[PDB]
């Protein structure tokens, strides 16, 4: 009977591809920052541009999911960093992903969360 | 027995009764007491940073659930790092239904570490 | 199939009614009726544009990477300042000897 | 001794604890003792300078303090010496700035 | 029009400060950005380091270089500038 | 251009039971301090920051 | 308690609501209703407050940071702001 | 034009009078008049000019030392302050 109980009424195609999400996040980070080194005047601009760079792609991809995008910029001055997260959600319909990017002077941590509507 | 409940035919948490709506200042207060009970006077530990972040998120989860937001999807994030002179920037912008969903966030700072706590509550239709 | 006690009683037309829900990326906590004092017009004026990115934590820091032109300029400036101080002190010492 | 209880909240700081705490009680004593914003800053700057004085040369800077309710400042400091902090309702911003008499292009 | 309260500076750069502050007021509606514009403009023009405080409610006491101080009013906003650095 | 998404749902579809699960905390990125990376930076002087 | 339009925190919502309603019965003159509400709301959160009470009035109010309260109850209108 | 309590400069009571007396007669609804008054009167004297108009009013307000006006015109009194 249409087996809709597998994903709480969501089609199999409505589930997202983690590799695609990672590719989109990496492309957004590259487009926002580029090969430019760290800049105290452009830190805010790069974080912002990363944010809506991911968000516009997620919105235009057009599936019934509420999206959470968190961006963490770090100057690669040798400081330590430890990030952990837990949540309560419907696991069979939702998921999470995190992308870690860096260069000689840059640290980008982008966490993407999706929750079925 | 695979018990299946019918749809309650209600679109908003308000029809479910009072206090069902995720309330940002209540969650902020819960977060603030969490910080002032667990994080003050603590120094950065590179070995223990991951465990502290994990425990902080886990402990936040049940006590934020204790507010009664049963039909709210909770997302809890805890980040802990070391102050040395680096420049950072933590921002987020998310796409969801603004009429039913909300958020809360706070941070604690010292010479040795920073600890930033984030929580997002999205109502489930 | 268990009917919830709080389930409302709707007719079939009401249940078949299509309800469109909307997702937007603006912060509810951000004030909407913001006004700033426009000094050019010397009057308070509404600020309809509000940034919807949520601020959590940011530090400007106090460090510059060595490969940065800012750090190169800073170390050059310190070098010329130290050289000028040394030259001034050497001139003072030579004047004292003379 | 403070004549009345005062609440302070830190907005932004880069100075180490043994100095920023000293500035905290300096601001508390200033707000307890004085009322004018000008003389509150006048007291704070002298109190901080007395306990942390320079050598008197141009290579070692001088301190500056501004206390007020509604203002903005765009200023520069030697590394790790801003303190912007809110006492009750008043904001106090203190920093040391080092003059560079031997800057290139000044001749 | 500028109203001068306290100033230790020659008129040639007093007028320059007045004009630059008026440009900043017409360019930015934010007290955050007006002060930054003034500081960067005078740091570029008359060498570092200059310090500017723009606002309506503040009490200050700073050490300034001789012939490097100005404190004036433009309309309802008080602007303080002094070279120390 | 506002980041937006639109969708249409039947009225009877509203009110689904929350099948929420409690998943434990997962480690996203464990970046330990690196003195080699920290040695590449020098203190900024002067540091220009604007306050409001 | 009837709230028409305002932005504030809900704890201040509750404080304004219950304080005003409990002042109504203790007081029997127009002016002290506003006076007590203002002075009571002063020492709690912030020192700058402004209060108006009565009927058959109306005024555009210069905006506030997050602190503007308007009420409507029992042929009574209550106004607070920072 | 009747005024009861005020602490203004002698040139500037009339400024309040000439700003409000004609503004009272031009408009009919008493919501936009305060929107009208505060716009120019800000641009003409100084920013903070919260005003209250109407009848049967009670208030207790923080007014700066040299800023207060209490009109009593046509049985509809007007009060303004910084």
Swiss-Prot record, chain C:
Compartments, record wording? Cytoplasm, Cytoskeleton, Flagellum axoneme
Report TM segments. none
Say what the protein does. Is essential for arm assembly or attachment to the outer doublet microtubule.
Q: How does it assemble?
A: Consists of at least 3 heavy chains (alpha, beta and gamma), 2 intermediate chains and 8 light chains.
Stated family: Belongs to the dynein intermediate chain family.
Protein known as: Dynein, 78 kDa intermediate chain, flagellar outer arm
Q: Which portion of the entire protein is included?
A: 50 to 147 of 683
UniProtKB/Swiss-Prot annotation, chain D:
Q: Does the keyword Cytoplasm apply?
A: yes
Q: What is one cellular component GO term in this UniProt entry? A: motile cilium
Q: State where the protein is found.
A: Cytoplasm, Cytoskeleton, Flagellum axoneme
tRNA processing among keywords: no
Highest taxon of the lineage = Eukaryota
Cite a single Pfam family from the UniProt record.
Dynein_light
- Keywords, in A-Z order: Cell projection, Cilium, Cytoplasm, Cytoskeleton, Dynein, Flagellum, Microtubule, Motor protein
Q: Record's InterPro entries?
A: DLC_sf, Dynein_light_1/2_CS, Dynein_light_chain_typ-1/2
Q: What is its main location?
A: cytoplasm
Q: What is this protein called?
A: Dynein 11 kDa light chain, flagellar outer arm
UniProtKB/Swiss-Prot annotation, chains G, H:
Main localisation, per the record?
A: cytoplasm
Single biological process term from Gene Ontology? motile cilium assembly
Disulfide bond entries: none
Instruction: Return the InterPro entries for the record.
Output: DLC_sf (IPR037177), Dynein_light_1/2_CS (IPR019763), Dynein_light_chain_typ-1/2 (IPR001372)
**What are the record keywords, sorted?**
Cell projection, Cilium, Cytoplasm, Cytoskeleton, Dynein, Flagellum, Microtubule, Motor protein
PROSITE patterns, A to Z: DYNEIN_LIGHT_1
Location of this chain's protein in the cell: Cytoplasm, Cytoskeleton, Flagellum axoneme
Q: Name one Pfam family in it.
A: Dynein_light
Look up the domain of life of the source: Eukaryota
Per the record, its GO cellular-component terms are:
axoneme; ciliary plasm; dynein complex; microtubule; motile cilium
Family under the similarity heading: Belongs to the dynein light chain family.
Subunit details for this protein?
Answer: Consists of at least 3 heavy chains (alpha, beta and gamma), 2 intermediate chains and 8 light chains.
PANTHER family found in the cross-reference section: DYNEIN LIGHT CHAIN
Q: What is this protein called?
A: Dynein 8 kDa light chain, flagellar outer arm
According to its UniProt entry, this protein's organism is Chlamydomonas reinhardtii
């Amino acid at each position: 009977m249409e087996d809709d109980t597998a994903f709480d009424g969501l089609a199999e195609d409505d589930l997202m591809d983690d590799a695609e999400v990672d590719t989109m996040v990496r492309e957004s980070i590259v487009a926002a920052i580029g090969d430019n080194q760290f800049a105290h005047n452009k830190i805010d601009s790069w974080s912002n541009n990363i944010v809506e760079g991911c968000l516009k792609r997620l919105a235009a991809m057009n599936k019934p999911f509420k999206y959470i995008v968190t961006t963490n910029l770090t100057q690669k001055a040798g400081a330590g960093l430890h990030a952990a997260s837990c949540a309560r959600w419907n696991e069979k319909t939702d998921g999470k992903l995190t992308v870690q990017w860096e260069n000689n002077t840059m640290i980008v941590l982008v966490s993407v969360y999706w929750l079925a509507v | 027995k695979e018990v299946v409940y019918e749809n309650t035919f209600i679109t908003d948490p308000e029809g479910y009764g009072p206090n069902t709506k995720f309330e940002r200042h209540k969650v902020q207060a819960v977060l603030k007491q969490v910080l002032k009970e667990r994080i003050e006077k603590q120094k950065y530990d590179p070995v223990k940073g991951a465990q502290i972040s994990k425990q902080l998120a886990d402990d936040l989860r049940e006590k934020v659930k204790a507010l009664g937001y049963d039909r709210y999807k909770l997302v809890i994030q805890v980040t802990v790092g070391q102050k040395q002179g680096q420049a950072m920037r933590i921002i987020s912008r998310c796409l969801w239904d603004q009429t039913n969903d909300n958020f809360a966030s706070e941070y604690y700072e010292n010479e040795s570490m920073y600890c930033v706590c984030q929580v997002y509550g999205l109502y489930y239709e | 199939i268990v009917k919830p006690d709080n389930q409302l009683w709707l007719s079939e037309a009401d249940l078949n009614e299509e309800v469109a829900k909307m997702l937007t990326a603006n912060n509810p906590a951000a004030p909407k009726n913001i006004v700033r004092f426009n000094m050019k017009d010397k009057v308070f004026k509404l600020e309809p544009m509000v940034e919807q990115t949520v601020v959590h934590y940011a530090t400007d820091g106090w460090l510059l990477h060595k490969s940065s032109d800012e750090a190169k300029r800073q170390m050059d400036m310190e070098k010329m300042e130290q050289e000028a101080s040394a030259r001034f002190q050497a001139d003072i010492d030579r004047a004292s000897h003379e | 001794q403070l004549q009345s209880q005062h609440f302070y909240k830190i907005i932004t700081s880069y100075m180490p604890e043994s100095f920023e705490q000293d500035a905290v009680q300096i601001a508390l004593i200033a707000v307890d003792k004085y009322r004018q914003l000008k003389d509150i800053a006048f007291y704070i700057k002298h109190e901080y300078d007395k306990k942390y004085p320079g050598s008197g040369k141009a290579t070692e800077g001088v301190y500056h303090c501004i206390v007020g309710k509604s203002f903005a400042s765009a200023v520069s400091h030697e590394t790790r010496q801003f303190i912007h902090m809110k006492v009750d309702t008043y904001h106090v911003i203190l920093w040391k700035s080092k003059d560079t008499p031997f800057t290139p292009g000044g001749e | 029009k500028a109203v001068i309260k306290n100033a230790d500076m020659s008129e040639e750069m007093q007028a320059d400060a007045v004009d630059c502050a008026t440009q900043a007021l017409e360019k930015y509606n934010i007290e955050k950005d007006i002060a930054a514009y003034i500081k960067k403009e005078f740091d570029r023009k008359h060498n570092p380091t200059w310090h500017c405080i723009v606002g309506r409610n503040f009490g200050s006491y700073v050490t300034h270089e001789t012939k490097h101080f100005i404190y004036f009013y433009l309309g309802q906003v008080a602007i303080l500038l002094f070279k120390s650095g | 251009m506002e980041i937006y998404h639109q969708y249409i749902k039947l009225r009877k579809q509203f009110g689904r039971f929350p099948k929420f699960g409690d998943e434990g905390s997962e480690m996203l990125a464990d970046i330990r301090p690196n003195e080699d990376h920290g040695k590449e930076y020098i203190p900024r002087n002067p540091v220009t920051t604007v306050t409001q």
